[PDB]
Amino acid sequence: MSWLPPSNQLSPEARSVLDRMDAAKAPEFNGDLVRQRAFYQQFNDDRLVEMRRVFRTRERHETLNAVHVQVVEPADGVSARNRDRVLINVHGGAFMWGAGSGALVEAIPIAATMGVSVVTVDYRLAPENRYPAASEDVTAVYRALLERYPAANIGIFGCSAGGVITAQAVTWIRREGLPRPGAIGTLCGTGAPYSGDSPYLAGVVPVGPGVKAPPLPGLLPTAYMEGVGADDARAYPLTSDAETVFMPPTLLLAGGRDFAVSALSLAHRRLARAGVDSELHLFDGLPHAFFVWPDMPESLEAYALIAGFFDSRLGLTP
Amino acid sequence: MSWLPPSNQLSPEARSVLDRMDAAKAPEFNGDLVRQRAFYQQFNDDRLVEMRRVFRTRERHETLNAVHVQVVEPADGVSARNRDRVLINVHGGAFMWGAGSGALVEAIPIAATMGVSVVTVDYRLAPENRYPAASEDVTAVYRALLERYPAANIGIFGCSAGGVITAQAVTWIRREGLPRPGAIGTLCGTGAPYSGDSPYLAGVVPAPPLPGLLPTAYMEGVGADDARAYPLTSDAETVFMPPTLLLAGGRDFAVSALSLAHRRLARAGVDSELHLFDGLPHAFFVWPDMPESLEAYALIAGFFDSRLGLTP
Ligand SMILES: [Cl-]
Ligand SMILES: [Mg+2]
Ligand SMILES: [Mg+2]
């Protein structure tokens, strides 16, 4: 928030990115979905230009069990170590955009940094489609990849809305009776509402002098989730002791100034108490989804933590 | 943070503790160290009463290599799980107080929750003593414990100033040529200055830049370059750290330093774990009357239970 100086931990590069992130903030769209989607198409294309400058990858289109995916590989080839591994990426974009370039923006840095194949899923978006459409889509992709890869060697990750869907996909996979994935990354978001202090600090809910700050909702406000109960453990698994016990090893990663931080710190407590192997990282001073901007050492550092989590937690053998 | 509601994650018991914490806040002492020490003696005696009502432990005084300790155990004895393990506690208290009751306030909940022997160190305090006096004292106790316990089965933990001294003791043990401890807990502080956003949000600053050193008399005249004094800022010292638990309240001025320490340990390939308790301040877990404190004690116990060895 505005009274503070930039975190004194940030690289000069990051301080530059923060100025541009603030300057690049969306105008009010007033329900004009077409104008909103155009804005974020340009945003995602802009970050993809930055990704392609830093990383060397090759992308193919594929269809797996009637779901459209992009398969992103390092241009140098997958490492020997990762021959029998694969990651599924679930893009962010507020459950309403991010298809195509936003999906590549999340898949490219991980494919290149880990030296692994990343299958980024073109799941059904809101407002046209509702929960559990995205869960069904990611589970269909997962089901296809089990023909080629052991469950223990498959990771699933996503940023923001993609972190929410990654957690929801886990429960849908269990509902289908499939073996659970080897590990997941619930980045800047998980299967829980936003809670705690961080939504107030990040300015998602206004606070200050003369302001009667309201309580926070116990549901994600997106149309994708409208009408889904708090008590649906498959929709909100990190609030459910039962679905939390069944989670695979989980990475939770956020910027320090991300409205998601308080929810992820509580989710990590719950996973620890449930006996699940989880890891939490916070990058002080950085906002929600900071690692879609690759021109700072902090983003490369995040890609290394994501790669290192999967490299440690996923199985290797065919 | 006056414009914020209490974190909606907190138990009703925690919301009560928040009000008790505010009632218990120190007045301005204007550098009168005697009045300050008297206030914190009373503070620590008050938390000790709370600890004694919640947990059943026995405390013994011992001397190990000329350093005074209290040995804190569950009243009916250490668990079979922990027969070949011991923790060293290093108390907080701004490097100037916390001796005796402060030390028991950190040792009792962990001894009782884990079912383990906790040896809490009566280290030399500022301003009478300066760095590296406390590192020397903790290392002397560690040296004595190696007579009975494998290095891999010894943990060291402390809160606030004690978390700082824990990290500094690690480097001192290495300087002495001893085997490194099995695991440490750098709770609400580590071998690094307070940095990042959290000191501003916690309101321990009104904005100006932050210091690159710890401002305490204990550290006066120690350089930033002393990697033994500030190991979590040194790439070299960080690689040699043992498995580390970092834990703080979400509103603690230590949060940002610990998140960076955790990133540094991960990059260095050290096993580390971070937990943050949304809505709680610095050293929250000296107040045992809330589920969140019991939960913190269980994370501390779980970390040492997973990372310490079991061989005799
Ligand atoms: Cl962690
Ligand atoms: Mg663990
Ligand atoms: Mg690790």
Residue numbers in the entry:
A (entry chain B): 15 to 332
B (entry chain A): 15 to 220, 227 to 332
What does the paper say about this structure?
The unique feature of this enzyme is the presence of a cysteine residue in the GCSAG motif which surrounds the conserved catalytic serine. Both of them had a typical α/β bacterial HSL-like fold, consisting of two canonical domains ‒ a CAP-domain and a catalytic domain. The active site of PMGL2 consists of a catalytic triad of conserved His302, Asp272 and Ser174.
It was the third structure of an enzyme from the GTSAG motif subfamily established and the first one with the GCSAG variant. Two cysteine residues, Cys173 and Cys202, were found in the active site of wtPMGL2, where Cys173 was a part of the 172GCSAG176 motif possessing the catalytic serine residue. The side chains of both cysteines were clearly visible in an electron density with a distance between their Cβ atoms of 5.2 Å. However, these residues were not disulfide bonded in wtPMGL2 structure as followed from the electron density. Moreover, structural studies and MALDI analysis did not reveal the presence of the disulfide bond between Cys202 and Cys173, however, it can be speculated that their proximity may allow for disulfide bonding in appropriate conditions and upon small movement of the main chain in the active site region. In wtPMGL2, Tyr208 residue has two conformations of its side chain with relatively poor density. The region 216–237 also possesses the same conformation in both structures with, however, an absence of electron density for the residues 221–226 of one subunit of wtPMGL2 coupled with a high temperature factor and the poor electron density in this region in both structures. Interestingly, PEG molecule was found in the active site of mPMGL2 (but not in wtPMGL2).
